């Protein structure tokens, strides 16, 4: 213990911060970007269909 247990608990806390937060926020950001981009593409396709309908009208 003493300095050893302090080093161990500091390592655990640093793991919780860095390893957990980095993967979590990276996954969140990447998933949000991919999902919103894909659904924006879907909305663009729907807008193209609506534009075709408006052109027919």
């Amino acid at each position: 213990n003493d300095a050893d247990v302090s080093k161990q608990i500091q390592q655990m806390v640093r793991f919780i911060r860095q390893e957990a937060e980095e993967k979590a926020n990276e996954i969140s950001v990447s998933a949000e970007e991919e999902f919103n981009i894909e659904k924006l593409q879907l909305v663009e396709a729907e807008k193209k269909k609506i534009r075709q309908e408006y052109e027919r009208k």
Partner: protein, 97 residues
């Protein structure tokens, strides 16, 4: 005669390379010895997934164990990892030879 000459040239080139190859293998004797020792030590040991650090329990000279900090510090500095392993001694009934 042409085939024999070509074979002789090929064998000569093979031996010329094989001299340095043998020297490299001579070094590779110690290299493979160290690699196999490390592999066997890892296989014997059981890592701790929760701490993300391999768990090691061995029979070491308790008086000389004080110097283990030097090797631990050398490994930490060479690896440059901020995370530092902790070495401890656990009392038990089993008598280390």
């Amino acid at each position: 005669s042409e085939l024999k000459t070509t074979l002789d040239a090929g064998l000569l080139h093979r031996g010329n390379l094989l001299q340095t190859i043998g020297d490299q293998f001579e070094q590779w004797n110690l290299l493979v010895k160290r690699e196999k020792s490390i592999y066997h030590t890892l296989n014997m040991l059981s890592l701790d997934v929760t701490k993300k650090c391999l768990v090691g329990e061995g029979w070491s000279p308790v008086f000389a164990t004080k110097q283990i900090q030097d090797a631990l510090e050398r490994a930490a500095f060479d690896s440059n990892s901020q995370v530092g392993a902790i070495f401890q001694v656990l009392h038990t009934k089993e008598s280390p030879p």
